[PDB]
Amino acid sequence: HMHNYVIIDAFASVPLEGNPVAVFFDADDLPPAQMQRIAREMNLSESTFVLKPRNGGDALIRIFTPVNELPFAGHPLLGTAIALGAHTDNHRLYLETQMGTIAFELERQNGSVIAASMDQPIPTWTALGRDAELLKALGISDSTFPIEIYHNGPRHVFVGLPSIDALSALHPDHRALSNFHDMAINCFAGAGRRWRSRMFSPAYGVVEDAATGSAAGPLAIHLARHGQIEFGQPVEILQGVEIGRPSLMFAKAEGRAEQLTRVEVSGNGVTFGRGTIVL
Amino acid sequence: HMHNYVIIDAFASVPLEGNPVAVFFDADDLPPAQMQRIAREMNLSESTFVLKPRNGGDALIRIFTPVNELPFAGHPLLGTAIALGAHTDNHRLYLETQMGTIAFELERQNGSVIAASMDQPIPTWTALGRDAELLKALGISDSTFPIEIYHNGPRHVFVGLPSIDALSALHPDHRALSNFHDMAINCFAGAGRRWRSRMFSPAYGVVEDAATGSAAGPLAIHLARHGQIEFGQPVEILQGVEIGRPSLMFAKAEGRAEQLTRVEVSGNGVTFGRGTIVL
Numbered sequence: 001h002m003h004n005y006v007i008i009d010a011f012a013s014v015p016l017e018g019n020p021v022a023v024f025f026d027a028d029d030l031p032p033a034q035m036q037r038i039a040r041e042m043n044l045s046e047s048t049f050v051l052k053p054r055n056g057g058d059a060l061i062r063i064f065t066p067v068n069e070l071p072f073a074g075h076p077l078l079g080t081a082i083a084l085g086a087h088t089d090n091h092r093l094y095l096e097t098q099m100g101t102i103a104f105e106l107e108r109q110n111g112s113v114i115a116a117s118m119d120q121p122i123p124t125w126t127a128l129g130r131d132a133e134l135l136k137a138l139g140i141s142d143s144t145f146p147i148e149i150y151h152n153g154p155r156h157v158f159v160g161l162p163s164i165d166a167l168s169a170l171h172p173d174h175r176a177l178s179n180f181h182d183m184a185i186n187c188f189a190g191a192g193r194r195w196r197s198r199m200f201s202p203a204y205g206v207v208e209d210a211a212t213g214s215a216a217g218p219l220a221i222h223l224a225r226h227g228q229i230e231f232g233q234p235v236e237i238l239q240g241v242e243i244g245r246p247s248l249m250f251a252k253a254e255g256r257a258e259q260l261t262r263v264e265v266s267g268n269g270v271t272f273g274r275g276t277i278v279l
Numbered sequence: 280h281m282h283n284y285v286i287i288d289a290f291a292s293v294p295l296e297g298n299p300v301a302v303f304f305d306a307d308d309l310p311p312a313q314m315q316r317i318a319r320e321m322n323l324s325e326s327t328f329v330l331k332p333r334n335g336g337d338a339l340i341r342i343f344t345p346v347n348e349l350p351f352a353g354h355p356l357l358g359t360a361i362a363l364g365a366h367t368d369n370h371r372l373y374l375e376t377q378m379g380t381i382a383f384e385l386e387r388q389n390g391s392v393i394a395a396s397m398d399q400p401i402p403t404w405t406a407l408g409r410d411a412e413l414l415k416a417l418g419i420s421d422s423t424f425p426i427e428i429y430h431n432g433p434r435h436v437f438v439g440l441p442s443i444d445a446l447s448a449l450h451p452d453h454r455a456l457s458n459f460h461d462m463a464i465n466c467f468a469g470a471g472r473r474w475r476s477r478m479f480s481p482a483y484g485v486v487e488d489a490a491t492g493s494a495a496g497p498l499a500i501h502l503a504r505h506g507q508i509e510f511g512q513p514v515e516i517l518q519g520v521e522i523g524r525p526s527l528m529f530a531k532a533e534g535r536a537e538q539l540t541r542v543e544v545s546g547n548g549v550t551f552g553r554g555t556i557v558l
């Protein structure tokens with residue numbers, strides 16, 4: 001009959017920062033075709049729907065862009081966990097997805113969930129093998145570190161820049177980037193614990209994304225493989241600064257490249273708005 | 280501190296049809312930079328903001344896409360008038376805009392505004408002069424009626440198809456259409472009182488629009504000039520069918536081409552959702 005929803009800015013503690021997701025509660029009465037139409041109506045990068053669990057978790061989450069269902073997504077699931085924290089006292093939340101059950105640790109102050117940490121799927125990776133084409137599209141001559149593409153659901157390519165100022169100076173040819181299908185292009189720069197990122201993806205319908213949570217785990221692996229951090233070291237990844245949606249993602253990859261045991265991504269989230277829809 | 284909003288599906292009587300707009304009430308405390316950030320957060324084609332009047336109208340409306348402020352827009356203003364009807368008993372609403380005050384007639388049943396009619400700016404027009412390029416981009420050999428571009432704020436080009444089935448069969452090259460700057464491409468077909476339309480606009484950030492209210496007045500003028508209806512005859516324009524967002528627009532242009540006295544566009548609207556934001 002009606003559904004309540006909230007809009008969460010994921011990877012932010014301040015509204016209008018981070019990356020929005022709409023979260024719809026009590027969605028068991030909605031067929032998937034209707035969920036898809038609602039996600040299209042909202043037009044946010046994703047809308048999620050909270051359903052009763054089917055495999056022993058706390059809830060089953062379905063994730064929709066305006067056009068299609070996704071089996072996994074980073075900031076939408078973080079935002080969903082933070083939104084659901086308003087309706088449970090549990091310290092941990094087990095959210096079922098198409099790719100299995102993901103564990104979230106919820107962080108509260110006086111009953112309000114302000115942040116969460118999630119396990120992520122362990123990615124696979126290989127060289128992209130299209131370096132000259134991609135570098136030309138980005139407008140630069142070379143990457144710092146190897147140009148590799150990671151898969152954890154989505155696909156994420158990483159191109160390294162020699163300084164944060166060089167990262168901010170990028171002005172990619174988005175028409176040229178559109179020849180890179182079913183992937184996002186993540187450009188990064190930094191040192192030690194602190195990194196900056198920018199993400200561009202014609203394939204995923206975004207000129208430049210504010211906070212690409214599914215890329216944060218892969219970036220931690222990339223930095224560790226290429227000697228910039230150790231495995232097991234947390235990194236801070238600040239994305240979206242140039243577009244006015246600063247987003248802070250934290251990530252850690254445990255183990256070694258050949259035997260990764262855990263990939264964790266965490267961030268703050270904040271409620272931008274709350275409402276009810278008429279169906 | 281907080282603001283209430285509603286989501287109106289304009290040019291529809293059923294939720295999830297028509298074309299959405301978010302309408303924010305009591306917006307006088309928001310600087311325009313903040314309105315723009317809110318419109319970006321919502322990511323709907325437009326968000327509007329209701330302000331105290333400055334020139335004797337009932338309210339001043341500011342209209343924002345996710346990227347810029349607009350001086351005029353069709354479905355966003357229709358939706359705003361319908362939303363505001365919930366907060367007044369007045370039969371007519373005078374909404375100030377950057378382009379002057381627009382009169383709306385509100386249609387109610389038991390206190391609920393179900394539809395409205397608006398005056399529109401009187402357009403100007405000329406031949407586009409890029410016919411072969413545009414026809415190639417649309418994938419067809421010729422137009423029925425002259426390919427003319429109308430200006431009433433936005434710019435709207437009209438290309439005529441020989442049947443509704445031919446209109447539905449269009450599969451434009453959106454890359455090629457992106458060479459048409461600061462305009463929308465409206466393709467139409469029909470007869471008598473009943474017409475079908477499809478609108479494509481890379482320039483305005485929409486692959487295909489559900490209901491292009493600012494094009495409805497121009498189309499009525501185009502059809503009258505080219506002998507398909509008379510001036511003063513209302514037409515029904517059904518848009519958005521192929522994309523699953525059917526939208527019914529009504530339009531009438533009074534006078535003659537050389538001396539147009541009124542351009543009226545009307546439609547239903549319906550509330551999809553209601554909420555509150557935290558700033």
Ligand SMILES: Nc1ccc(-c2cccc(O)c2)cc1C(=O)O
Nearest residue numbers: 070071072073074153154204214
């Ligand atoms: N914003 C997104 C858009 C698309 C995807 C995605 C694409 C292909 C396969 C797949 O499993 C996920 C992910 C995200 C995300 O936020 O992670």
Ligand SMILES: Nc1ccc(-c2cccc(O)c2)cc1C(=O)O
Nearest residue numbers: 349350351352353432433483493
């Ligand atoms: N959805 C829209 C997007 C852009 C415009 C527009 C563009 C340039 C100048 C201008 O005055 C208005 C109008 C609409 C509309 O709905 O009418």
